[PDB]
């Protein structure tokens, strides 16, 4: 038991993805984003619930019920 002898348990520390650092890594160039499109752009991607322009599920279905206040 010395400060240069302690070791973490196996599996506790995983490394972490580093994108854009060469071919050998497997995440070089595009960095896992594919080619072009909105999802490849910095800060790109659509908001939660967006399904294209199709009326989303949470707006296609009717609202129902009321909150009690006595239940609280």
């Amino acid at each position: 038991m010395r400060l240069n002898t302690l070791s973490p348990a196996e599996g506790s520390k995983k490394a972490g993805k580093r994108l854009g650092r060469g071919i050998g890594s497997g995440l070089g160039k595009t960095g896992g984003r594919g080619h072009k499109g909105q999802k490849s752009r910095s800060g790109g991607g659509v908001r939660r619930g967006f399904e294209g322009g199709q009326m989303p599920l949470y707006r296609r279905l009717p609202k129902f019920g009321f909150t009690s206040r006595k239940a609280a």
């Binding site: 071919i23 050998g24 070089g28 160039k29």
Partner: protein
């Protein structure tokens, strides 16, 4: 006097005193190896093989050294395809010194 024998899937024409590099053999350095399958022996007259291997042909050799050959570099590359791979290789060998050729 020379003779032809097959060792590691390959054939070699040898004469007494000559050192020949073969594929790795599972013998120690100072041990003596005998090749009993002699394809041809030619001294003054030549002895062929009605059937493969001359009847009483034996080549005696002494193992000399075990080692690895020169490093070769394998390069694989696919242009415009974001693919590249490199690998090294050193092939094992066994040198033997021919001591005697027996008709």
């Amino acid at each position: 006097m020379y003779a032809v024998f097959q060792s590691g899937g390959k054939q070699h024409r040898v004469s007494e005193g000559q050192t020949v590099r073969l594929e790795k053999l599972d013998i120690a350095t100072g041990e003596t190896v005998e090749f009993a399958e002699v394809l041809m022996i030619a001294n003054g007259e030549e002895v062929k093989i009605g059937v493969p291997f001359v009847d009483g042909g034996v080549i005696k050799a002494e193992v000399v050294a075990h080692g690895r050959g020169e490093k070769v570099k394998i390069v694989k590359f696919r242009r415009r395809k974001h693919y590249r791979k490199q690998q090294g290789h050193r092939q094992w060998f066994t040198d033997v010194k021919i001591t005697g050729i027996s008709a």
